[PDB]
Symmetry: C3
Subunit: 346 residues, 3 copies
C-alpha cells in the first residue's frame, strides 16, 4: 500500500503549480510515463513522447508551459510548470518515499576535530569522522561517518560528504558539493623520477585539488593532485563512480564523466563535455567544449571541435561508423576480389 493520497488540485496547490483536468482526481504514487495508471503522477520530458502522452493512463502528468501549449486539447490531467518537469516530479516523489538520514544529527561525540580546525554553524559531523589541522568546514555541511577532512582543506557551505570519503591535505571543496562514499580527493599523482636504468623515485606532489561549486563526485572515484599545479574540477560538473582523474587534470564547467572513464595527467577538458563509460583520454592534450565521447573511447590526440567521437583512437563518429561497417564487410569484399581473380583470360 501507499504512504499518502492527494487530489490533483491539492497537489497542484502544494507544488505552487497550475493544473488542468479533474481537480478531485486522487493520486497515491509516481510512475514513469509508459507505465503510469490512474493513481500515478508522472512527467513528460520533451522527447518523442507524443504518442506516449496520448496513450498515458496517468492520473497526473507534469508538463512544461511550452509542451502544454502543444497538447492543450488532450483529455488528461496536467500539472503545468515553469520549472523543469523532472524537478517538480522529484518533489512529488519525496511525498511517497521520504529521504532519510543516519539518525546522528549535529557533531557526534566521537568526531575527532583538531583544535586548530574551524567548524562553522549548523554542521553535521557523523561518528568517527576526522577533521585535521587547520581545516575549515562551512556552515550547514555534512561530513559522513569516518570521512577525513585533511590538513588545511576547506569545504564550502552546504556540501554533503558521504561516509568514508578521504579528502587529503590542501583540497578546496566548493559550495554545495556532493561527494559519494569512497572518493579520494588529493591522492598523489602517478609521477616519478627515473634513476639507475629505469628505477622509479617517488616525488612529493604538492599541488592542490580545486573542486568548484555544485560539483559532484561518485563512489570510489579518485582525483590526483598536481605535482605543483592544481587539478581542477569546475562548476556544475558531475563525475560518476570509479573514475580516475590524474594529476593536473582540468575539467571545465557543466561537464559529465561517466563511470570508469579515466583522464591521464595534465589534460584539459572543456565545458559541456560528455565522456562516456570506460573511455580513456591520454595525457598532455585538450578536449574542446561540447565534445561527446562514446563509451570505451580511447583518445590519443587533442579534439579541437565539437561533436560526437568514438573508437580508439577516437575519430569523429561518422568516420568510425564507416570503419566498423567496412571491417564487417571484408569477407564480401574478398569474395568480390576472388570473383575478379577468377577472370584470368588469354
Amino acid at each position: 500500500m501507499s504512504q499518502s493520497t492527494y487530489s490533483l488540485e491539492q497537489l497542484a496547490d502544494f507544488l505552487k503549480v497550475e493544473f488542468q483536468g479533474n481537480g478531485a482526481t486522487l493520486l497515491s504514487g509516481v510512475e514513469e510515463i509508459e507505465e503510469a495508471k490512474t493513481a500515478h503522477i508522472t512527467f513528460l520530458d520533451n522527447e518523442k513522447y507524443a504518442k506516449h502522452l496520448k496513450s498515458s493512463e496517468a492520473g497526473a502528468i507534469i508538463i512544461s508551459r511550452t509542451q502544454f501549449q502543444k497538447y492543450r486539447d488532450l483529455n488528461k490531467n496536467f500539472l503545468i510548470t515553469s520549472e523543469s518537469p523532472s524537478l517538480v516530479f522529484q518533489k512529488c516523489l519525496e511525498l511517497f518515499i521520504t529521504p532519510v538520514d543516519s539518525g546522528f544529527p549535529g557533531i557526534h561525540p566521537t568526531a575527532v576535530i583538531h583544535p586548530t580546525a574551524i567548524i562553522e554553524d549548523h554542521v553535521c559531523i557523523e561518528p568517527y569522522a576526522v577533521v585535521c589541522q587547520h581545516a575549515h568546514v562551512g556552515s550547514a555541511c555534512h561530513i559522513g561517518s569516518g570521512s577525513v577532512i585533511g590538513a588545511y582543506s576547506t569545504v564550502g557551505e552546504h556540501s554533503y560528504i558521504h561516509p568514508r570519503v578521504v579528502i587529503r591535505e590542501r583540497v578546496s571543496i566548493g559550495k554545495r558539493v556532493i561527494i559519494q562514499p569512497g572518493a579520494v580527493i588529493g591522492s598523489c599523482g602517478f609521477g616519478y623520477v627515473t634513476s639507475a636504468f629505469g628505477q622509479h623515485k617517488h616525488l612529493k606532489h604538492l599541488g592542490k585539488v580545486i573542486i568548484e561549486d555544485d560539483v559532484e563526485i561518485g563512489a570510489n572515484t579518485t582525483i590526483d593532485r598536481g605535482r605543483f599545479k592544481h587539478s581542477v574540477v569546475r562548476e556544475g560538473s558531475k563525475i560518476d563512480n570509479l573514475v580516475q582523474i590524474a594529476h593536473q587534470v582540468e575539467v571545465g564547467q557543466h561537464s559529465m564523466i561517466v563511470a570508469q572513464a579515466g583522464i591521464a595527467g595534465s589534460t584539459k577538458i572543456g565545458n559541456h563535455v560528455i565522456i562516456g563509460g570506460q573511455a580513456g583520454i591520454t595525457g598532455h592534450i585538450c578536449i574542446a567544449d561540447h565534445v561527446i565521447m562514446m563509451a570505451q573511447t580511447g583518445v590519443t590526440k587533442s579534439i579541437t571541435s565539437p561533436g560526437i567521437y568514438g573508437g580508439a583512437p577516437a575519430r569523429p563518429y561518422q568516420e568510425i561508423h564507416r570503419q566498423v561497417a567496412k571491417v564487417r564487410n571484408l569477407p564480401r569484399l574478398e569474395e568480390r576480389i576472388a570473383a575478379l581473380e577468377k577472370l584470368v583470360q588469354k
Copy 2:
C-alpha cells in the same frame, strides 16, 4: 602442520587412487611446480603439458582425463567430481583461516538506539549501525563499516572492513562483501536545465542484494531514482565493478573485475561478463550469454552463446574478423597483383 599418505588421503576424500599408497604428502602446489611432498590437480585441456613431466606425489584427476594418462606411472586420485573442489578439500587440511581477534560486538561500535542487532553477531571496532537497521544472526560486520538507515543484512552474511551500505538496502542471506564496496550509491542521473546545467536528483530506490551473492572489493552499486536495483541469488561480482542505477542482474551470473553495466539494463540468469567489458543502459542480455573480456555491448543480446568485440558480435564472427583485419596487407598485395595485370594494352 601434519602429514598424510596417498592411501590415507584417498580414504579421507573418499576417492580411488593409483600408484604408491605409502607416498608421503605435506602440502598443495600448482601442477608444474609440485614435488613429491605435494598434492596437485588437473582440470584443463590447456594444462596437459605439465602432467607428462610432473613431480607431484598426488594428482587429483577426473574419470575422463584419467583415460588419457592412466598409462603414466604417476600417483593419481581419481574423482567423478570437480578436481578443483577435491583439491580445495586437501588445501583446507594445510591452511587455517584467521580473524581480527576482535570477537562479538566491540565497545567502540556505534549502534543507533533504533537499530536491531540479533544474536551471535560480530561487529568490529568503529563500525557504525544507523537508525532502524536490522543485522541478522551470525553476521560479521567488519571494522569501520557503515550500515545505513533502514538497511537489513540477512543471517550468516559477512561484511568486510570499510564497507558502506547506504540507506534502504536489503542484503540477503550468506552474502559476502569485500572491503571498500559501496552498496546504494546515488545513480548518475541529473536534470539538464535551460543553460546546459545539471541538477542533482536524490535517488530513493532500494538496492536488493539477494541470498548467496558475493561482491568484490571497491565495487559500486547504484540505486535507481525510485525503482529497484537487484542482484539476484547466486550471483558473484568481482572487484572494481560498476553496477549502475536500476540494473537487474539475473541469478547465478558472474561479473569479472573492472566490468561495468550502465543504467536500466537487465542481465539474464547464468550470464558471464568478462573483465573490463562494458554494457550500455536500457538493453537486455539473454540468459546463458558469455561476454569475453573487454567486450563493448551496444545492442541487446537476444540469443545465448559467446560474444566478444566492440561492437559485440558472436565469437565465431569476431574471431573471423580479427583474422580478416590481420590479413589486409595480403588483400592489398593481391590488388597490386591485379592492378599490375592492366598490361592488357590493345
Copy 3:
C-alpha cells in the same frame, strides 16, 4: 604561507649548482616550461619540450650539463646540474610549498591496538586506525586515519599508509612502501566451481599478498590474494590508482602499472615492464622483462620478448600501427576495386 622570493644566486647556493645569468634575478615560484614567467623557476628534463626553451620567459631554467652545451648561445638564466633536472626542480618546489601532516603526532588515543600486536619506535598511528591480533608495525611507520592492519600482517620500517587502506590478514608489506587512501590489500581472489545446474561454489582463499620494498600502490587499487600461493609485487614497482591485481599475479621489479589497468589470475609480469592505463591482461600468461604495453591494450597471449605492444588483441607496435593504417584505408582500398571492376575484358 611561503610568499617567498629568492635571488637566482641564493637559489644556486641552496641547490649547490652552477648558474649562468643575472644572480640578482628574483624568483618567487615554480612553473612549467611553456608558461614560466620572469618570476618563475622551471626545468627541462625531456627533449620533448626544448621547443619551449628558445622563447621561454622563465627567471631561471634548471638544465643538465649536456643541454647547456646544446643551448649555450641562448640568453637565459640557467641552473646547471649534473643530477636529474626534475629532482633538482623538486628541491625548489619544496622551498615554496611545504609538506603538511594531519597534526596528529604519534599514537592517537583512539587507535585500537590488539594486545598481541607489535608496535615499534617512532610510529604514527592516526585517529581510529585498527591494528589486529599479531600484526606488526615497523619502526618509523605511519598508519593513517581509520586504516586497518589485519591479523598477522607486517608493515616494514618507514612505510606510509594513508587513511582508510584495508590491509587484510596475512599480508606482508615491505620497507618504505606507500599506499594511497582506499587501496585494499588481500581481498579474496575471484575463484569458483560452477556446478551442472549453473551454481557457483566459493573457494576459500588462504594464500597471502607479498608487497616488497619501495613499492607504491594507488588509491582504491585492489590486490587480491591467491588460493594457496601468494600474489607478489616485487621491489620498486609502482601501481597507480584503481587497479585490479588478481589472485596469484606476480609483478616483477621496477615495473609500472598505470591507472585502471587490470591483470587476471596466475599471470606473470617481468621486470621493468610498463602496463599502460586501462590495459587488460588475461590469466595464466607471462609478459617478458622490458615490455611496454600501450594504453587500452588487450593482451591475450604471452609476450615473450621485449619491446612495445598495443591493440586488443595486443600485437607488436609495428603490426598494430600498420593495422590501424590499413583499417583507415578501406574506403580508399575498395575505391581501387571500384575502379578495377569497370573492366570490359
